[PDB]
Amino acid sequence: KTIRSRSIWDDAHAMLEKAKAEGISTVWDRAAEQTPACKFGELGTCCRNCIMGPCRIANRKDGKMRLGVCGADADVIVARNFGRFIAGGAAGHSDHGRDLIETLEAVAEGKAPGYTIRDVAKLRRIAAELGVADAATRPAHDVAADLVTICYNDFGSRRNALAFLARAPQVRRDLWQRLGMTPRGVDREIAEMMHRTHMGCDNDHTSLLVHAARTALADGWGGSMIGTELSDILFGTPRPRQSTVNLGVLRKDAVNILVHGHNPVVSEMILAATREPAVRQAAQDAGAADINVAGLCCTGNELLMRQGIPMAGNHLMTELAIVTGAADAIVADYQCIMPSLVQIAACYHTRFVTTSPKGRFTGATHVEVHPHNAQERCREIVMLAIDAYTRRDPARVDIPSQPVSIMSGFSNEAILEALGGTPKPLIDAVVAGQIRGFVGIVGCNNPKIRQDSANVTLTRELIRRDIMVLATGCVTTAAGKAGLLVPEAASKAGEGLAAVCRSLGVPPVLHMGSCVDNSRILQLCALLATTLGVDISDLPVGASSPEWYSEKAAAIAMYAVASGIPTHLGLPPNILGSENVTAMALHGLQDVVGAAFMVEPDPVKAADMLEAHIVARRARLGLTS
Amino acid sequence: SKTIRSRSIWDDAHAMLEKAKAEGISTVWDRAAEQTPACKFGELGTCCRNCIMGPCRIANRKDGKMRLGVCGADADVIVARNFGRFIAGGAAGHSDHGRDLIETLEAVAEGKAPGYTIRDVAKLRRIAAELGVADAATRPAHDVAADLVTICYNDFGSRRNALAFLARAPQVRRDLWQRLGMTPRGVDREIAEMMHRTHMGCDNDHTSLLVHAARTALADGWGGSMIGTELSDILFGTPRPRQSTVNLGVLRKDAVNILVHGHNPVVSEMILAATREPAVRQAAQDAGAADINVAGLCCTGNELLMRQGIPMAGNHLMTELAIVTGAADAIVADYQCIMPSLVQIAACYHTRFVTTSPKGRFTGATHVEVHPHNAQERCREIVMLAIDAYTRRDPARVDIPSQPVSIMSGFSNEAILEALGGTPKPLIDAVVAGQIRGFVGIVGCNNPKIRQDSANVTLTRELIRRDIMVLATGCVTTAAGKAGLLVPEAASKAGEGLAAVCRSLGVPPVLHMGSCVDNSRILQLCALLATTLGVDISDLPVGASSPEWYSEKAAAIAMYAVASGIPTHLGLPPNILGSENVTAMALHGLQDVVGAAFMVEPDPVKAADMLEAHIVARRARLGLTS
Ligand code: SF4
Ligand code: SF4
Ligand code: SF4
Structure with missing residues (x-):
């Protein structure tokens, strides 16, 4: 009954039963241990921004603890916490977009073996949209270099408004300007938010939330939009295509590689590596019928949109995918990768491979990927997956369901x-x-x-x-x-x-x-x-x-x-x-x-x-x- | 009072704590007592609030529960991510200050800062030549300032391999930072990556987190702070040895007392210039004051002290007590380390609490926002508010406790x-x-x-x-x-x-x-x-x-x-x-x-x-x- 209450899916139910029998603790078990949670943390009335604190704002009969040591009330303390909360989220998308800029710059310089401009037509359109001179006719690498310069300037501190903000209707741009919300720089709004939320800087909850809106606008119209548009330029604009979802996308007769995280710069090359004939021969020599790549979280969404790669599951399925006993390797970049996946992988044969200098997990096998070495590094990662597959225990394999058909690719x-x-x-x-x-x-x-x-x-x-x-x-x-x-x-x-x-x-x-x-x-x-x-x-x-x-x-x-x-x-x-x-x-x-x-x-x-x-x-x- | 003696070593602090007690004014020490004892998890850093799968607490329990966060993070990750954001908040404080100095210098170079000049053109040419500006010794000063502005702004961009002022560090130190992955590349960039790393499911290695924390702080000392210091000397003069005074006794009963608080001299330098204008001085005379007396608090007071010899009224825990003197006619604040309780204590008196920065907003304060293009007119308006508040001063509540102590300052x-x-x-x-x-x-x-x-x-x-x-x-x-x-x-x-x-x-x-x-x-x-x-x-x-x-x-x-x-x-x-x-x-x-x-x-x-x-x-x- 407990397992039934945690999910609506049979493949999740099957793996929660399996993990229970194998004594494997999951995210639901740890969520239970952390319940009940701290009231002050849930209410946002806790401040740890200096060591005159930590301070708690409480509603007490004796009237004490209404203010922090510095004098901040609950409105400021809650607003500053929410401002940093938004800033951390905007920073997650910001660094992602920055990585796409660097990847496109490597391609324009001819320093990314195996990478190309898959969608030159969209490259010329986006560059012309943002003001690149003669984007329709100049050599593609020159046009890409100018678009790279434009995007980098949005990660600078000299603009009055982000480049893609011109897409918003004029009435919306005028409103943002009147309110002081116009995002000026992707990194700048994040840094100013951390300054405002420092002790004794911004102490007005209205001002803090207005800048929180400005910081998030620097994400949606900056970090995220640059990430989306450059990803389509580098790896292709999505078109409608069919695929499958759920744990049944894993195959018992194949080497199963699960890509996890958010950056397609890595998973796209993992997929290209698994399609090389010498790499496929090595998997066949190991007893596998093929190499099967399946997706998790956002990087799985990316491979689904552009390549039709089937998705194994979402956030709370990530641990359960290893519990299937068929996950031969997890290839991770960054964001939303629960570090418990390292421990659960240790319970099996699964290799947990990190690839990003920003996504370090204690105990993981680190094979760092950059544009200049992705082709060789990703080949090495697939070989590790083929090797782990040879040590896979067949008696602990349980792939629960049959995959469900889906349609994706609606850019x-x-x-x-x-x-x-x-x-x-x-x-x-x-x-x-x-x-x-x-x-x-x-x-x-x-x-x-x-x-x-x-x-x-x-x-x-x-x-x-x-x-x-x-x-x-x-x-x-x-x-x-x-x-x-x-x-x-x-x-x-x-x-x-x-x-x-x-x-x-x-x-x-x-x-x-x-x-x-x-x-x-x-x-x-x-x-x-x-x-x-x-x-x-x-x-x-x-x-x-x-x-x-x-x-x-x-x-x-x-x-x-x-x-x-x-x-x-x-x-x-x-x-x-x-x-x-x-x-x-x-x-x-x-x-x-x-x-x-x-x-x-x-x-x-x-x-x-x-x-x-x-x-x-x-x-x-x-x-x- | 044994308690009052235990809170400070200074007589002027003791005198104002006695005065605040008699007048029923609670101070920073009183709120510190209410927040004691503090939460064990907050003090230990073993609490995480970075997502609403939490908040999570790491505890040492007999049954072994609550050893990991909901996402699986242990105490090493949770403590390092909390400390990494702690450092990032501090680096952001100095970063935005340095960015404001760049914008002020760019306004001067464009001729869009009435009342501002390049006070130290010799230092401008030296700093610009040091950072690679071509012909910094001979070209027009505004052209040289514009090129230095571009270099400083690029350190707030995302295309550098190392910060410009990092060349000052010895080569062995630069090579070490390079081997460790600590070389600061962009002032704002390191802060943003730190917030990305400390997001759930990104950086989950306490060694990696602290290495980047060092990189983030290096982007402050060799970037945000160093740009702020060197451009401040260019804009307002390089400090030289000079004499002044400290403590609450720098306040005068016979004068309009203006206390500058915060960190940015772009405001306080123009406040001081405003008090020297004859029409502004006439308004103080018409109100019955012998002079206009500007005194400093916290870092902006340090700045006016180093360059102008302006006497300092006190440091961090003296800020409330300076208002309790009853002679503080105005507080002019910019940003950082300005306790919001000063607004309430000011309301107990005639004191005007004036904010000047779009980043330093205090609910209930009088906001007169200052930018380089309007600082001269706005600062004039702020001093007029101080003179007006001075007319409403209750003389029966005035108690300036001590005699000022002589000091020597200005050691750049x-x-x-x-x-x-x-x-x-x-x-x-x-x-x-x-x-x-x-x-x-x-x-x-x-x-x-x-x-x-x-x-x-x-x-x-x-x-x-x-x-x-x-x-x-x-x-x-x-x-x-x-x-x-x-x-x-x-x-x-x-x-x-x-x-x-x-x-x-x-x-x-x-x-x-x-x-x-x-x-x-x-x-x-x-x-x-x-x-x-x-x-x-x-x-x-x-x-x-x-x-x-x-x-x-x-x-x-x-x-x-x-x-x-x-x-x-x-x-x-x-x-x-x-x-x-x-x-x-x-x-x-x-x-x-x-x-x-x-x-x-x-x-x-x-x-x-x-x-x-x-x-x-x-x-x-x-x-x-x-
Ligand atoms: S630090 Fe704050 S949120 Fe965390 S447990 Fe303590 S009171 Fe609750
Ligand atoms: S910033 Fe203020 S409320 Fe927050 S911990 Fe420090 S003293 Fe307490
Ligand atoms: S990031 Fe992990 S430890 Fe922190 S609150 Fe979220 S689930 Fe808990």
């Missing part, structure tokens, strides 16, 4: 091509009421919530109401395993959405990529708002993260709100200890940026709130629901 | 070398001969957990007694000053060797070298001595000490001193003791890789023994007498 380019090259067919459907609105579901998993129970229920509730769902991150696996990522899932949608979906041959849920690919949603909203001559806060759109946990999810939520997109959260951030901060997040922000946060653990109630905002925006546009 | 490296005849050779000769056995930079704040300035003053006395010259920055300036140690006559309190050298040069045994960002002056001086002697900084008989620190910035200064080869003592430990591995590396392991380590010791006399021990050992390795 904005792919969406517009399916519409004939213009957004007019999409705008027509919204005006007609067939598609009443769009909601991006971009959440994770969280041990406090039965895995994917809220992701799937909300996705079902929204498509029932003719609201198209845009899926990224961990929701990709949830919607996939529920059979909603195929064109045949139109039968589960309402009459309006099903008709549009069947007309285009697309699912009612569109996989648009990884967590950084939420910038694709920003681009799509900006494109629609610009076309109609309105603000993004006028579009019938919404965002939802029903089962989030990370700093990156909070930064995504913040820049969606700051861009005019109403954003729902299944769980609250650590801010409830301040009524002023909570009121601003839930209500005050609506007055300034035209959107706000929503906290609601009931997915059906979450759908009512998302649909309510959509209906209100449809009315202001003069449409019927 | 340029001033130190000028007193030596233009070369460091007399200083090196004194060190080799054993008259000056070593140097210790005493930096740091106050901390309510320690009787105010009891450790700062005792250590300063213990060190100069042992012929160890003290270089004072930050809050120690006020401590040494009020103890009468910042004057040439204080050579009598030193040993025979230091007293002879001090009397020979006419300098005190304690040299005030400026604010917290001016600790970069100590890096420059150490680097100059190491290069001249052809050794590493880890070979010099030097030390750093922060007996009464509290802030993230103090931790970042200590870290980049250690990472640069300077043994650094702390009176109190950071929140790291919950990890034996992290504690061992900070106290011992770093000695193996960077040639220096942290020291935690609350007894100031024992702190002097440890600093002297490292100094003696380095003298032996140099082939000198101890």
Whole structure:
């Protein structure tokens, strides 16, 4: 009964039973040990920013402990904690985008063996969009070098606004300018946030949250957008394609390589290495029928979008994938890689390989990958996987399920091509009421919530109401395993959405990529708002993260709100200890940026709130629901 | 009151604590008492709040539970990530300050800063030539300033391999940083990568986390802080030796008392210029005041002291007590280390609390935001508010406690070398001969957990007694000053060797070298001595000490001193003791890789023994007498 309460999936149930019998502790077991959690940490009323503290703000009968040693009240302490929370998340996406710039610079210099510019057409378009002279005709490497220079300048301190901010409608850029939210530099907003949250600097919760919006905007319109667009340039723009999801993508007769993390610069070369004939011969000589690459988390989302590589699972499936006994190697870069995977791998034959200087795990096998040596290093990593496969215990192998078919690869380019090259067919459907609105579901998993129970229920509730769902991150696996990522899932949608979906041959849920690919949603909203001559806060759109946990999810939520997109959260951030901060997040922000946060653990109630905002925006546009 | 005596060693502090008690005004010590005892996990660093799978606590339990976070992170990772963000917050404090100096200098170069000039064009040309500006000696000053601005901005970019001022460090030190992966590449970049590394499921190795923490702090001392110091001297003048006064007695009953608080001189320099305008002086006269009296608090007070000789009212734990005097007519604040309780205590009086920076917002304060293009008009408006507040001053609540103590300030490296005849050779000769056995930079704040300035003053006395010259920055300036140690006559309190050298040069045994960002002056001086002697900084008989620190910035200064080869003592430990591995590396392991380590010791006399021990050992390795 305990195992049933932790997930809605059979492959998760099977592996939780297996781990229990083998005495392997999982994320759910550790979540139980940390319950009940500290009230002050959950409320955000704890400050550790100097050693005059640590300080706790409590509501006491005797009136003590209302202020920190420095005099800060709960509003400042909660706001500064939330500001650093957002900054850590924005920094996660920022360094990711910085790595794509360096990779593209290596290709332009001819110092990346095995890497190329897969999409020169998009390279010329993005470079011309940002002001590169003669981007349409000059040599591709020269054009790439100028785009590299432009992107690096957004990681400098001399701009007035980020380069991609020009995509946002003019009314939105003027608003950001009036509010002091205009993001100037990707790294700069992160550094200034850490300065503001230092003792005795910014001590106004309104100022701190305004800069928190500015910091997250430097992510969505900077770090993440650069990461998405350069990844398509380097590795190809996604197109619609079919694949499979869940633990059944692992094969007993093959060498199973699971890529984990966020950077496609590594996993793309891992895949190229497994396709070399000499490498395949080595696997055959070892008794394997083939080498099978399968994806985890966002880098799995990336390989899914561009190569159709099947995904093994999402956040809370990562440990369970090793428990299958068929994981021969885990190739990790950085972010959201639970260090418990090292210990669980030690229980089996699995090799846990780290590849990034930023993602170091004690006890892991480190094979550091850079653009100049990726081809040889990734070949070496695959050979380690083939070797570990030879030591695999066949009696402990249990692959639980059969893979479920999914459809992926819905970039904005792919969406517009399916519409004939213009957004007019999409705008027509919204005006007609067939598609009443769009909601991006971009959440994770969280041990406090039965895995994917809220992701799937909300996705079902929204498509029932003719609201198209845009899926990224961990929701990709949830919607996939529920059979909603195929064109045949139109039968589960309402009459309006099903008709549009069947007309285009697309699912009612569109996989648009990884967590950084939420910038694709920003681009799509900006494109629609610009076309109609309105603000993004006028579009019938919404965002939802029903089962989030990370700093990156909070930064995504913040820049969606700051861009005019109403954003729902299944769980609250650590801010409830301040009524002023909570009121601003839930209500005050609506007055300034035209959107706000929503906290609601009931997915059906979450759908009512998302649909309510959509209906209100449809009315202001003069449409019927 | 036995309690009031236990909180500070100074009479003006005792007098104001008695006054605040009689008037029912709670101070920083009173809130410190309420927060005692503090949470064990917060003090140990074994608490993580970096995601809402937590918050997580690491406990030592009989049943073995709560050994790992929900993500699987152990105490070593959790403590190192918390300490890494602690350092990042401190480096960000100095980073944004240096960035503001770059923008101010760019405004002057563009001719868009009315009232600002390049006060030290000679230093501008020297710094620009040092960093590679072409024809810095002959081209127009504004063109030279513009090219230096571009170089400094590039250090706040993401395309450099090493910071521009890193060339000052000895080659052996630069090679070591390169081998360790510590070379700071971009000021903002290291801060952003640290926040990325400490995100869940990124960097989960406490050794890697601390190595990048060193890299982040090096981006401060050799980047954010060093840019701030050198451009400040270019904009506002290079400090030279001068006389002034310290303590609450610098406030005048017959004058409009304006206290500048914070860290950025871009504001306080123009406040001072505003008070010298005849129309502004006429307004003070029309209000009945004999003059306009500007006095300093914290680092911006250190800045005005070094360059203008403006008297200092007090250090960190004196800031509230200065308002309790009843004579503080205005507080002009920029950012950092400004306790928000000053707003409430000001409301108890006539005092105007004025904020000036978009980054330094205080709820309930009067905000008059200052930028280079409007500073001259805005600062004029701020002084008028002080004169207006002065008219509403209640004379019955006025109590200025003490008589000011004389001090000598303005010892920049340029001033130190000028007193030596233009070369460091007399200083090196004194060190080799054993008259000056070593140097210790005493930096740091106050901390309510320690009787105010009891450790700062005792250590300063213990060190100069042992012929160890003290270089004072930050809050120690006020401590040494009020103890009468910042004057040439204080050579009598030193040993025979230091007293002879001090009397020979006419300098005190304690040299005030400026604010917290001016600790970069100590890096420059150490680097100059190491290069001249052809050794590493880890070979010099030097030390750093922060007996009464509290802030993230103090931790970042200590870290980049250690990472640069300077043994650094702390009176109190950071929140790291919950990890034996992290504690061992900070106290011992770093000695193996960077040639220096942290020291935690609350007894100031024992702190002097440890600093002297490292100094003696380095003298032996140099082939000198101890
Ligand atoms: S959140 Fe604060 S009070 Fe709670 S355990 Fe962590 S440090 Fe202690
Ligand atoms: S910054 Fe203020 S509230 Fe936070 S720990 Fe320090 S004294 Fe306490
Ligand atoms: S990062 Fe790990 S240890 Fe920290 S709060 Fe999240 S789950 Fe707990």
